[PDB]
Structure formats: C-alpha cells, structure tokens
C-alpha cells in the first residue's frame with residue numbers, strides 16, 4: 001500500500017497472509033474454513049496465516065493453517081486477468097473471535113463513489129521498494145466505470161472495477177495482490193492489478209466480487 005496508514009494490530013480481522021516460506025499475497029477469510037484471494041496468487045504449498053499484524057514476529061494472535069485445496073476460477077485468463085479470483089480451503093477450521101473473523105459476501109454490487117478500505121503488506125513506494133512488516137490500510141473510493149475505462153482503454157471487463165485516486169499518490173501495490181477491498185462491511189473487491197503503483201491516471205484495478213457470489217456459494221457447498 002502506497003500512501004496509506006498503519007492499520008493497527010488485528011483491526012482488519014479478516015485479512016490473511018498467504019505464505020510459501022515468505023509472504024507473497026493477501027486474502028480474505030469468508031468463513032471458518034475458506035479464504036478468497038486472486039487467481040494470479042495461485043501456487044502449490046500455501047500456508048494461510050490468520051491473526052497477523054507483524055508478519056516477521058510471533059505476537060500471540062496468529063493461526064497458521066495449511067491449505068487442503070485451491071480452486072482457481074474456471075474462466076481465469078492470466079493474460080488479461082479476467083476472472084482473477086481463487087478459493088482456498090483450509091485443512092482445519094479457524095477459531096473465530098474479535099481478532100480473527102470472517103467478512104461477509106455482498107448481496108449487491110457497490111456503486112462508484114462508495115468509500116472502501118484496502119489493506120495489505122505490499123510495497124509502500126511508487127518508485128523503489130520498501131516492504132512493511134505491519135499491515136497497512138488505505139481508504140479509497142470506487143471510481144466510475146467510464147473513468148476506469150478511460151484510464152485503461154481496452155482492458156477493463158465487466159468483472160473489474162477501479163478504485164483509488166486519479167491524481168496518484170495512494171494505491172495498492174505489489175504484495176497486496178489477493179487482499180480485500182471492503183465497503184460498508186462487505187467484501188466488494190480483490191486486489192488484482194494496475195500499471196505500476198500510485199501513478200497519475202493509473203488507479204488500481206480490482207476483481208468485482210459481487211459477480212462471483214453464486215460461484216463462491218456453490219463451490220463451498222460441494223467441496
């Protein structure tokens with residue numbers, strides 16, 4: 001996250017870190033046994049880390065649970081990043097409380113102008129690299145589809161939305177991928193892609209979760 005603020009420990013209780021020997025992507029806990037992330041975060045051998053603030057220090061609220069199954073969306077296209085969503089089933093159920101909690105799926109899509117919270121452990125610089133150890137947060141609005149399509153001609157599908165600031169300076173970045181965009185207490189987006197980070201006229205692009213609720217619910221019910 002570029003241009004954000006330190007969230008505070010366990011203030012974003014649905015935020016997960018995906019670990020394969022190191023943090024590589026975020027995700028969101030949607031019930032005691034399932035996480036949703038980005039398909040471009042797929043790899044084998046994932047450990048899901050819940051209850052984290054400092055990802056390099058054991059602080060006492062963590063739960064480390066291996067993945068038993070990963071399911072990439074059937075229509076994910078790695079070239080265009082259309083349908084950039086993936087479900088991860090945990091080997092055992094997480095223990096839920098105030099510091100580790102699930103986030104609700106949306107019943108309706110959010111409109112442009114709605115303010116959302118984006119979080120992650122990704123890069124904090126737009127030029128160069130500095131990775132934080134503690135979770136960072138950013139408040140940003142959903143942008144209109146017309147502004148999003150004007151920023152990225154020919155690249156925005158109906159399964160994507162833009163959020164952030166056309167003036168630059170505040171965005172999600174590398175290492176935030178897969179993490180949550182939460183608006184009015186519901187998971188509306190997944191950190192997916194962008195052209196660089198925090199550049200003028202190049203806001204972040206997010207997977208539009210409201211289009212996938214039926215697929216998520218049906219998949220969880222049968223796996």
Ligand SMILES: [Ca+2]
Nearest residue numbers: 054057058059
């Ligand atoms: Ca920790």
